[PDB]
Curated annotation (Swiss-Prot), chain A:
NCBIfam families: L13_A_E. GO terms for molecular function: mRNA binding; RNA binding; structural constituent of ribosome. The modification N-acetylserine is found at S1. GO terms for biological process: cytoplasmic translation; maturation of LSU-rRNA; negative regulation of translation. Component of the large ribosomal subunit (LSU). Mature yeast ribosomes consist of a small (40S) and a large (60S) subunit. The 40S small subunit contains 1 molecule of ribosomal RNA (18S rRNA) and 33 different proteins (encoded by 57 genes). The large 60S subunit contains 3 rRNA molecules (25S, 5.8S and 5S rRNA) and 46 different proteins (encoded by 81 genes). The gene is RPL16B. N-terminally acetylated by acetyltransferase NatA. This is Large ribosomal subunit protein uL13B.
Swiss-Prot record, chain B:
Present with 52400 molecules/cell in log phase SD medium. There are 2 genes for uL6 in yeast. Component of the large ribosomal subunit (LSU). Mature yeast ribosomes consist of a small (40S) and a large (60S) subunit. The 40S small subunit contains 1 molecule of ribosomal RNA (18S rRNA) and 33 different proteins (encoded by 57 genes). The large 60S subunit contains 3 rRNA molecules (25S, 5.8S and 5S rRNA) and 46 different proteins (encoded by 81 genes). uL6 lines the binding pocket for eukaryotic elongation factor 2 (eEF2). PROSITE patterns: RIBOSOMAL_L6_2. This is Large ribosomal subunit protein uL6A. It comes from the Eukaryota. Keywords: Cytoplasm, Ribonucleoprotein, Ribosomal protein. One of its GO terms (cellular component) is cytosolic large ribosomal subunit. Belongs to the universal ribosomal protein uL6 family. It comes from Saccharomyces cerevisiae (strain ATCC 204508 / S288c) (Baker's yeast). InterPro entries: Ribosomal_uL6-like (IPR000702), Ribosomal_uL6-like_a/b-dom_sf (IPR036789), Ribosomal_uL6_a/b-dom (IPR020040), Ribosomal_uL6_CS2 (IPR002359). One of its GO terms (molecular function) is rRNA binding.
From Swiss-Prot, chain C:
GO terms for molecular function: structural constituent of ribosome. Component of the ribosome, a large ribonucleoprotein complex responsible for the synthesis of proteins in the cell. The small ribosomal subunit (SSU) binds messenger RNAs (mRNAs) and translates the encoded message by selecting cognate aminoacyl-transfer RNA (tRNA) molecules. The large subunit (LSU) contains the ribosomal catalytic site termed the peptidyl transferase center (PTC), which catalyzes the formation of peptide bonds, thereby polymerizing the amino acids delivered by tRNAs into a polypeptide chain. There is a cross-link at K124, K130, K148 (Glycyl lysine isopeptide (Lys-Gly) (interchain with G-Cter in ubiquitin)). This is Large ribosomal subunit protein eL20A. Component of the large ribosomal subunit (LSU). Mature yeast ribosomes consist of a small (40S) and a large (60S) subunit. The 40S small subunit contains 1 molecule of ribosomal RNA (18S rRNA) and 33 different proteins (encoded by 57 genes). The large 60S subunit contains 3 rRNA molecules (25S, 5.8S and 5S rRNA) and 46 different proteins (encoded by 81 genes). eL20 forms multiple interactions with RNA and proteins in the central protuberance, connecting components of core functional centers that are located far apart. Present with 54300 molecules/cell in log phase SD medium. There are 2 genes for eL20 in yeast. The modification Phosphoserine is found at S31. Its main location: cytoplasm.
UniProtKB/Swiss-Prot annotation, chain D:
N-terminally acetylated by acetyltransferase NatA. GO terms for cellular component: cytosol; cytosolic large ribosomal subunit; nucleolus. The modification N-acetylserine is found at S1. The keyword Cytoplasm applies. It is found in: Cytoplasm. Component of the ribosome, a large ribonucleoprotein complex responsible for the synthesis of proteins in the cell. The small ribosomal subunit (SSU) binds messenger RNAs (mRNAs) and translates the encoded message by selecting cognate aminoacyl-transfer RNA (tRNA) molecules. The large subunit (LSU) contains the ribosomal catalytic site termed the peptidyl transferase center (PTC), which catalyzes the formation of peptide bonds, thereby polymerizing the amino acids delivered by tRNAs into a polypeptide chain. It holds the Pfam family KOW. It comes from Saccharomyces cerevisiae (strain ATCC 204508 / S288c). Keywords: Acetylation, Cytoplasm, Ribonucleoprotein, Ribosomal protein. One of its GO terms (biological process) is macroautophagy. One of its GO terms (molecular function) is RNA binding. It comes from the Eukaryota. This is Large ribosomal subunit protein eL14A. Belongs to the eukaryotic ribosomal protein eL14 family.
RNA sequence: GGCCAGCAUCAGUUUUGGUGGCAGGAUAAAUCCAUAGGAAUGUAGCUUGCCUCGGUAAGUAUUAUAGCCUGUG
RNA sequence: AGAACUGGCGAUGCGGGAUGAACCGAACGUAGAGUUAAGGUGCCGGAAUACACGCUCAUCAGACACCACAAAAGGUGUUAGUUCAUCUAGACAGCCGGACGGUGGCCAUGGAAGUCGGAAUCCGCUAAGGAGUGUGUAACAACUCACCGGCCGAAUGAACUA
RNA sequence: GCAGUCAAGCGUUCAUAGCGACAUUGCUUUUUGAUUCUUCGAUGUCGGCUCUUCCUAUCAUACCGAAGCAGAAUUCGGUAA
RNA sequence: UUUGCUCCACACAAUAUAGAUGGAUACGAAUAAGGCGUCCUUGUGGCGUCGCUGAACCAUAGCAGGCUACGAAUUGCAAUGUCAUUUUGCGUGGGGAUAAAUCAUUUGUAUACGACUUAGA
């Protein structure tokens, strides 16, 4: 409903995100997907690795600069999955895939802006407990990514800079609840409680 | 078939306190202290006494339950190693060429090097894990004793030894040389 | 399907040499009173020299369950045609109704042996009156004093597509 | 030794006598009580006090309510209505925040526009006092 | 006075809902009421090592200081 | 390659099988509303990330007949099942104890008490202990266990089916 | 052309270390054949030279396992092109 | 030759929109486990409590929103009924800064031509 949506992608499944994204973005919603190195995927690591090494195998023989561009970053693996789900070869798929902005980690603009979660793709809800799942950062790194040890050095600064905000806010609102709980014993609230507020 | 409840139980001799929170075991004792991670298993834990603990799995279905008793043994081995401790007595064997073993402080931690493994010149070194103390028998000067609390460290180090002191490109039915474990026990009994 | 249990009474057509031809009863499980008759003539034509055109259906009534709010442990003798040869089986089912047991038979047979409704004949269905002649663990485990088990990993279904807090599986 | 801090989880668990709340059916929302257990995935129930029949049902169609009352295995409707009324389960239930929020939703939804305007007026009084106080 | 839209009253085709009356079936089965027996995933009661009001132990006990099943009406 | 009956393509578009002369559905005047076929409803893709009982996790999974392939033989990987059975007069798993004597039962005699080895077969003790299952000293010993018991207090092996 | 399954036997004793008959299941299209759909208003037709790439059913090289492997030397097999 | 150029301040005009007309409202991590409040022998602590949907939370009255510390009809029974935000120009007036590249010539660490590399008041 909001003009722009910010999707935390931790504990998510890739192809079950992308079928929601690829429709919500084709229907006119701007989406950004953030913390994509924390994505999750079905299947064991060796298996989902071979399913990439049998992709790197596929390159145009007479000149491989014409052929399938095997991207190694999670932000681009997800974009691959979505580009497949979208008719990117038209001005509708094109127009949609410019409504999307995918990142690794959470940059500042989407740092101080609320994040959400797609429940019909959370590994927690969907997958059986006991199944093996593979993490996209480990995968990308094993197929030739480079910037894993950076994202962890930045997102941690994000986290310690955010935890202090949360503590500030909590140690502000614990008194708002007290001074509005100290004000709920009047007719103004005994009457609202009958209306359902 | 999917069962309903398969539960094992873990006795606890005194002096021990077993702290769990989010499937992270921590055990203490006279000998020392230890920890373990079991996030990769679905399993519960309850405290009916300070004298024992009850571990449980629910429907499972013949795969979770085989890890149930496994976990039970792992925790039990852990308690055993932080109450008594583990002792692995390896021994040397050879025909002509002795094996000259010693401990050495390299740039980092301790190592244990062996020379004259069948006349070889390759001084083959082995790291010592952190949880291990280490010595030589004295009643007979042709053994070695690894020791500690964690069996999965002690035994892994002993195997790390006897896997590198293994002859290659020769008849093993004849070249029964190297070092090998001989006794597994404790350092209290 | 939404099986209903029928009571089918049929009869060879009455000729002068025997105008009281002896009647034959079958207790059939079917989705309706059209295929009930079909299965009657199917199983009868397997035992007695009679067809539809050489017979008539006297009665098709329904048998509604008497104590459908009483949990029971049925035992089910059955034969089934595999891809290579027939076999007989015995399976025990815990349910309230003699026909719900059959619904959950055809399914756990179509899964465990990939047998269709056409490759299955229900020989005998009957309660085990006492909880000591059961022979199967997948029933006997629910026959325990003071049963109680949890549902560990709960999943709350979303109506909307976006949520603003991580969901929680606790029950 | 020192007391062993051991804690895993304290589930509400399907048992005989447990109370449940039905989410998806003809008798949606209406409370009931489990009687006995058919298998892992389904049970039977009887809520007589609220007008629920004696059903056999799965556990997706319901929710497990924490509260619980004592009864024997396989009990009947009269017996269940006996025990329900003894324990005063609807009183233990309406006390809770769960039913309070449920009723609150059901009441917010049933508001005329007049009520929805009265609310806007009234909240412009409470917040005035609260913003005066948090100063 | 002509074109374009809106509403109503109607007509044809069709879609989607709320509600009532009736008939049948084992003149539904059931639940419920009554009643005759039976047993345990054995309730009280009584034996039973100590003890939380017999909590445990396991014998007895067939509704009793819970209940259930079956049959008939 | 060649015949029989029918239906089709040819001469035929249309919705479906991604695509396809023949398959499934169905046969065409131009248009509008409604309903369906066959096929399908995660997204591309219009339509349930619907409900229900289960099976499967594959270091070449598998996924719309025609159709674009796959076998014999195997697997305690798992699920369900069939037929035997042993057995609370305590089997089977697991440790603890004994396993002795008549007697080296005769010969191969360079040496075999059981045993590098060939003919040959029974008593005493008992809970039970092979005139011998293994290790092997020129031979003797000493060990092993099938034969029995203590804990044990549960049930269990064997074959087969799909 | 290649491989597999039973395994009667060879194998000083020892089916299967290695091989392995009588039978039997398949794979391949680098053979030869059968067929005749395309091409007869033309697809330049043997071999070699040159040059690149691919396949594995690996001759060698790397790490391993198994032998009737003492060593040495050999054979069988595996991951691997 | 402040004809020129560059800003910001407002006055109009002009061109375009992959599409807002209340608010994109911020902890982290686990899920066979956690959030919040308190006490504290500050611990993987004791107690209580919440979830079981954001159906929330916040804002929300006034000429399409006014005068003073009253006016609002007659868009005549509906006909977006005009506000969003980039890019361009015109002039008005208050400032601010005063250049390089290419051709041609040339060198050869370069070169098929272009290109590259160098030098030149």
């Amino acid at each position: 409903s909001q003009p722009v949506v910010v999707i935390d992608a931790k504990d998510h499944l890739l192809g079950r995100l992308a079928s929601t994204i690829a429709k919500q973005v084709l229907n006119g919603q701007k989406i950004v997907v953030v913390r994509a190195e924390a994505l999750n995927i079905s299947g064991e690591f060796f298996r989902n690795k071979l399913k990439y090494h049998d992709f790197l195998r596929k390159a145009t023989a007479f000149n491989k600069t014409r052929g399938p561009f095997h991207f190694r970053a999670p932000s681009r693996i997800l974009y691959k999955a979505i580009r497949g789900m979208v008719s990117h070869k038209t001005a509708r798929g094109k127009a949609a895939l410019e409504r999307l902005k995918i990142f690794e980690g959470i940059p500042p603009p989407y740092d101080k802006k609320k994040r959400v979660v797609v429940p019909q793709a959370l590994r927690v809800l969907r997958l059986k407990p006991g199944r093996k799942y593979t993490t996209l950062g480990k995968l990308s790194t094993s197929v030739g990514w480079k910037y894993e040890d950076v994202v962890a050095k930045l997102e941690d600064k994000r986290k310690v800079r955010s935890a202090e905000y949360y503590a500030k806010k909590r140690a502000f609102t614990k008194k708002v609840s007290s001074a509005s709980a100290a004000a709920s014993e009047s007719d103004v609230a005994k009457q609202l409680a009958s209306f359902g507020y | 078939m999917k069962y309903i409840q398969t539960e094992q139980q873990i006795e606890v001799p005194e002096g021990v306190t077993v702290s769990i929170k989010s499937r992270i075991v921590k055990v203490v004792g006279p000998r020392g202290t230890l920890t373990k991670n079991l996030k990769h298993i679905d399993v519960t834990f309850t405290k009916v006494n300070n004298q024992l603990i009850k571990v449980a799995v629910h429907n499972g279905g013949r795969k979770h339950v085989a890890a149930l008793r496994t976990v039970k043994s792992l925790v039990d081995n852990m308690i055993t190693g932080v109450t008594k401790g583990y002792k692995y007595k390896m021994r040397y064997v050879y025909a002509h060429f002795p094996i000259n073993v010693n401990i050495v402080e390299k740039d980092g931690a301790k190592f244990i090097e062996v020379r004259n493994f069948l006349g070889d010149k390759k001084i083959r070194n082995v790291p010592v894990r952190d949880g291990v103390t280490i010595e030589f028998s004295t009643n007979v000067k042709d053994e070695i004793v690894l020791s500690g609390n964690s069996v999965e460290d002690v035994s892994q180090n002993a195997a790390d030894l006897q896997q590198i002191c293994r002859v290659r490109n020769k008849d093993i039915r004849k070249f029964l040389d190297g070092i090998y474990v001989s006794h597994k026990g404790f350092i209290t009994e | 399907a939404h099986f209903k249990e029928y009571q089918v009474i049929g009869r060879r057509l009455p000729t002068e040499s025997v105008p009281e031809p002896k009647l034959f009863r079958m207790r059939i499980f079917a989705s309706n009173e059209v295929i009930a008759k079909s299965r009657y003539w199917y199983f009868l034509q397997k035992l007695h020299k009679v067809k539809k055109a050489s017979g008539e259906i006297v009665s098709i009534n329904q048998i509604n369950e008497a104590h459908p709010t009483k949990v029971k442990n049925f035992g089910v003798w059955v034969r089934y045609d595999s891809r290579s040869g027939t076999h007989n089986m015995y399976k025990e089912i815990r349910d309230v109704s003699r026909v719900a047991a059959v619904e959950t038979l055809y399914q756990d047979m179509a899964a465990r042996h990939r047998a269709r409704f056409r490759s299955i004949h229900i020989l005998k269905v009957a309660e085990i009156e006492k909880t000591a002649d059961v022979k199967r663990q997948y029933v006997k485990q629910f026959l325990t004093k003071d049963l109680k088990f949890p549902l560990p990993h709960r999943v709350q279904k979303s109506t909307k597509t976006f949520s603003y807090k991580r969901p929680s599986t606790f029950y | 030794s020192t007391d062993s801090i051991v804690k895993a989880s304290n589930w509400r668990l399907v048992e005989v006598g447990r109370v449940v709340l039905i989410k998806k059916g003809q008798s949606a929302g209406k409370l009931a009580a489990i009687v006995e257990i058919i298998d892992q995935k389904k049970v039977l129930i009887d809520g007589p006090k609220a007008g629920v029949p004696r059903q056999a049902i799965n556990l997706g169609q319901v929710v497990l309510t924490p509260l619980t009352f004592a009864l024997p295995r396989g009990a009947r409707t009269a017996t269940v209505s006996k025990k329900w009324a003894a324990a005063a389960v609807c009183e233990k239930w309406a006390a809770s925040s769960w039913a309070k929020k449920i009723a609150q939703r059901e009441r917010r939804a049933a508001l005329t526009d007049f009520e929805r305007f009265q609310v806007m007026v009234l909240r412009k009084q409470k917040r005035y006092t609260v913003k005066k106080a948090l100063a």
